[PDB]
């Protein structure tokens, strides 16, 4: 799961901009 | 979008069990652990397990072993959680999470006679 | 196990002010690559987690940028450089260095009058 996490910021910026 | 839809609310009988579930789309079900973690009185967080949908191998949380247990089934991008010998303390919200950054809407499971 | 301690329960700002909300861990959160796998979310009522920071100080995806997490050894913090009305909620730190992950109890976002 850590190697998952270390990729996150693949996504584009367009999630949960409303927090 | 990356999508986990689970199962509806569930009012089950103490001493019983409930299978629970959680849809996964909009990415490669196969390519990603998927991890289950309760919510309890709207606030405190626990984490329950991972389980590789590839493979099925699982990372418990040893504090859960024997009350929950993780499946997969591949060909419908479903995980599940069943819980076990029900108790009011498993009263609770049951969220799926890929990667703990896309999590569903949660399950709340009530036990009560 | 890791304890995540949160501090405070709850904080009462004004809407614009900055805010700073700390986490400790009770021992090294250091994962055997060498990073630390600090998250915080913001969870508001009703509604499941949402991840703002991972890895300490990472910012997820289109997070605002007023939002921004760092810390080392057992210290971490998230600030907050002006606090919104969709800011308002329970913030949550989780660790995912170690087996079993944990998560801390929550520190609740709240408006002083």
């Known amino acids: 799961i850590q190697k998952e996490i270390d990729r996150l910021n693949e996504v584009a910026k367009n999630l949960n901009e409303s927090l | 979008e990356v999508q986990l839809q689970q199962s509806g609310p569930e009012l089950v009988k103490p001493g019983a069990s409930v299978k629970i579930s959680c849809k996964a789309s909009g990415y490669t079900f196969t390519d990603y652990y998927m991890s289950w973690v309760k919510q309890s009185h709207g606030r405190s967080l626990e984490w329950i397990g991972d389980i590789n949908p590839n493979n099925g191998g699982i990372t418990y949380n040893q504090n859960f072993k024997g009350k929950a247990t993780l499946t997969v089934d591949k060909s419908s991008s479903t995980a599940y959680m069943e819980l076990r010998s029900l108790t009011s303390e498993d009263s609770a919200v049951y969220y799926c999470?890929?990667?703990?950054?896309?999590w569903g809407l949660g399950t709340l499971v009530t036990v009560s006679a | 196990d890791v304890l995540m301690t949160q501090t405070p329960l709850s904080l009462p700002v004004s809407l614009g002010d900055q805010a700073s909300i700390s986490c400790r861990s009770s021992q090294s959160i250091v994962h055997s690559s060498g990073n630390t796998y600090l998250q915080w979310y913001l969870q508001k009522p009703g509604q499941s987690p949402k991840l703002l920071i991972f890895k300490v100080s990472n910012r997820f995806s289109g997070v605002p940028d007023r939002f921004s997490g760092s810390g080392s050894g057992t210290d971490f913090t998230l600030k907050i450089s002006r606090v919104e009305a969709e800011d308002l909620g329970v913030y949550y730190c989780?660790?995912?260095?170690?087996?079993?992950?944990?998560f801390g109890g929550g520190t609740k976002l709240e408006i002083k009058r």
């Open positions: 999470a890929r990667t703990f950054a896309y």
């Open positions: 989780f660790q995912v260095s170690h087996v079993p992950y944990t």
